[PDB]
Design a protein around this motif. Structure first.
Motif, short mmCIF file in Angstrom:
data_model
loop_
_atom_site.label_atom_id
_atom_site.label_comp_id
_atom_site.label_asym_id
_atom_site.label_seq_id
_atom_site.Cartn_x
_atom_site.Cartn_y
_atom_site.Cartn_z
N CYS A 165 0.85 -1.21 0.00
CA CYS A 165 0.00 0.00 0.00
C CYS A 165 0.87 1.24 0.00
O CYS A 165 1.81 1.34 0.79
CB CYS A 165 -0.92 0.01 1.23
SG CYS A 165 -2.07 1.43 1.28
N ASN A 188 -8.77 2.20 -0.90
CA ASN A 188 -8.79 0.75 -1.16
C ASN A 188 -9.57 0.41 -2.45
O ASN A 188 -9.46 -0.70 -2.97
CB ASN A 188 -9.39 0.03 0.05
CG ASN A 188 -9.69 -1.44 -0.19
OD1 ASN A 188 -10.82 -1.81 -0.52
ND2 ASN A 188 -8.68 -2.29 -0.04
N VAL A 240 -6.09 -2.18 4.44
CA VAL A 240 -7.13 -1.23 4.79
C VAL A 240 -7.53 -1.39 6.26
O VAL A 240 -7.63 -2.51 6.77
CB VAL A 240 -8.35 -1.43 3.87
CG1 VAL A 240 -8.86 -2.86 3.94
CG2 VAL A 240 -9.47 -0.45 4.21
#
Length: 31
Positions: free
Chosen positions: A1, A16, A26
């Protein structure tokens, strides 16, 4: 991420979506 996204854990509900495979990390609390 992306770190830019990871710092924005609130945004992660939206992030997300734009980063589905990129950001699986997330926040489950906001989810």
């Amino acid at each position: 991420c992306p770190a830019l996204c990871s710092h924005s854990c609130r945004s992660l509900k939206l992030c997300n979506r734009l980063l589905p495979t990129a950001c699986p990390d997330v926040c489950d609390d906001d989810w």
